[model samples]
Target chain A: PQITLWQRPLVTIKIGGQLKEALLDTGADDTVLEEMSLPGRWKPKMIGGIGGFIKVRQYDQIPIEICGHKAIGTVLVGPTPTNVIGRNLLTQIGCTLNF
Target chain B: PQITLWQRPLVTIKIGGQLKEALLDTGADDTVLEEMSLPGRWKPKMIGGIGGFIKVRQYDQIPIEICGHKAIGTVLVGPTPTNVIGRNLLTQIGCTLNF
Candidate 1:
């Protein structure tokens, strides 16, 4: 199936056993989620984006569902303006750039 | 043609008489380029991204080349961490989210 790219491309994802809407950002390197409590111990890390670097909890091997496709990958949790589905998970869900 | 989604999802683009590489950001609402001078009077505006918002010079009717595909649309100039080709131009290049 195909989804048209909206002005603000977004999709619903399930992580930490909760559903959330996230930006489908091919520009982002890792999937970043808004800060939330999870049941796992993560390493403290930092990620850089358009604005700057942010402190995040790097949770590894987490299962996330993106539009019904189940994928396991790295998820960064922090004070991100929006939840972003990065290429780390986007590739698992079979996203591509075409012309 | 198809291109795999790299961790950074970068592509070469020609804009404002120069060639530059930019992120293919489906999540971004409008295309943003690192501060550059173009020969046009643009409206000063702002855009919000993963980190926050930044003031931009909004130039309309700018011609850009994405992978050899010619497109004319809105291009924002500001201090962005990376040049981003947002959905405003992605749609013209026939980009979509597929699974």
Candidate 2:
């Protein structure tokens, strides 16, 4: 799928048996999702963005389906304006920047 | 040009007679650059991201070249971890997400 930048590149993702939309963010190094509960042991972590930083729970080896493409990676749960699918998972789905 | 997510999609941009590298951030609604001086009357503004919000100087109709593609739009100068070429300008360069 080729998505133009005229709008936010929001894509559907399946995680924790729930479907939700997330932004494909090349600017983010790690994936961060809205606070949610998952069945796993998570570690406390912090991530920074354009604004400042936030403490999050890092859950590793989480299986997610992004736009029907399956991938497993570390997912950070925290308070974010929006769910972000960052480089870590974007690479798994073979997402790229095209011009 | 197609840039894989395996690496940060950093590209050279020419703005205000200066060359700098910036990320193609589809998740960001507006473009943000590290604090810099530009020739223009800019208004004080605020923008929020994954972590939080920050104050910025909004300079509109600024001429910029992204990977040799010319564009003119609003560019925010603020305290950012990295220079981000958001959807606002990414569209101008015909950049898109392809999977």
Candidate 3:
């Protein structure tokens, strides 16, 4: 399915077996989600953005559903302004920036 | 021109009489630039993102040339991980995410 981006491109997704919405950020190098519980343990990583840097729990190869499209990749959980679906995950679900 | 988003969509832009590169980020609400000199007075603004928040100088009605396309709007100058061309500026040049 194609998404039109006139504003922040928000999409529905299933993460940690829970339904939620996230912003599809092509500018971001990695996906960052709002803090949530996962079944397994993850590693800690620090990431920088337009603002500053923050620590996040990086979960590897997590399955996620983006607008009904199935994809598996890393997910970073921390204090983020919004859930961002970055390039790592976007490539899996055929999300591209056209025009 | 339509851009393929296999990675960060970096585009050449002219701002403040200097040529630079910026990523077209639909996920970001406002444009953020790495430390650069501009001609006029700007107000201080704090913007939040996946990492955290940062202080920026908000310059309004600034003329920018993005890939031969002319645009005029607000541009934020601050310490950023990268130069981001957000929705505010993207819209000015009729940039939209298709697909």
Candidate 4:
């Protein structure tokens, strides 16, 4: 079935190239991980957001596949908001947003 | 001259009731002062943002004026992003945005 915007199933997917058991949110449209939550040594390709493009080391975006559902795309390295999930993964799958 | 968004003068304004010499930004539409920057005692009413409305005391919204210019209106009291200013001040002044 073709899903509509803001209509995706809200399932808690695992996040973190470094951190384990990080939940992925489909409601929001930005991929984010925490500095304290990530694994010891894992670097991903840096993707830009409302912030911008181009990320540096310790800020590099890595390929953290969500073993739960598969968040296969570029995730933006960020100090995870409230240590929770955001929109990074949803947009990759052509999300139909509520807004 | 009417100001254009992303092209206005970004003057650093003083922020904080409890904190002192907190800089305000004209580029940002959000009011932000730091937890480490304010004076010893000041609490204002809380206002809502991209997050939501219905404020509180610890999260109160206070009235503050800029020393150089005037930041008149209900100043949104909250955490500043990256210890810097953003779009809150500009929009309150009837901003004509960039995009």
Winner on TM-score between 3 and 4 is 3
TM-score of chain B of each: 0.93, 0.96, 0.95, 0.36
Candidate 3 clash pair list? none
Q: B1-99, model 3: which lDDT tens digit per residue?
A: 766666678989998788999998888889889999887899989998766678899999899998878999999999888899888877777776555
**What are the per-residue Cα lDDT tens digits for candidate 4 across B1-99?**
222222222334554543345322222234554454332345565543223343322322444544344454334334433333334443333332111
Regions of model 1 farther than 4 Å from truth? none
Per-residue lDDT tens digits of candidate 1, residues B12-98? 899877899988888888899998887778998878766667788999999999878899999999989889998999999898877
Candidate 3, superposed: residue stretches over 4 Å from native: none
Residue A9, candidate 4: how far off, in angstroms?
26
Clashes of each: 0, 0, 0, 35
- Which is better, 2 or 4, measured by lDDT? 2
Q: What lDDT score is found at residue A42 in candidate 1?
A: 91
Task: Order candidates by TM-score, high to low.
Answer: 2, 1, 3, 4
DockQ (Cα-based) per candidate?
Answer: 0.70, 0.88, 0.63, 0.03
Error of 3 at A70 (Å): 1.2
Chain A TM-scores, one per candidate? Answer: 0.92, 0.97, 0.94, 0.37
TM-scores, in order shown? 0.93, 0.97, 0.91, 0.30
* Weakest lDDT window of 10 consecutive positions for candidate 4 chain B: B1-10
RMSD (CA, angstroms), candidate 1: 1.4
Task: Order candidates by lDDT, high to low.
Answer: 2, 1, 3, 4
Give the number of the best model, judged by lDDT: 2
lDDT of 4 by residue, A1-93 (tens): 222212212234455534444432322234454444444454655433223343422423444444334545544454433222344444333
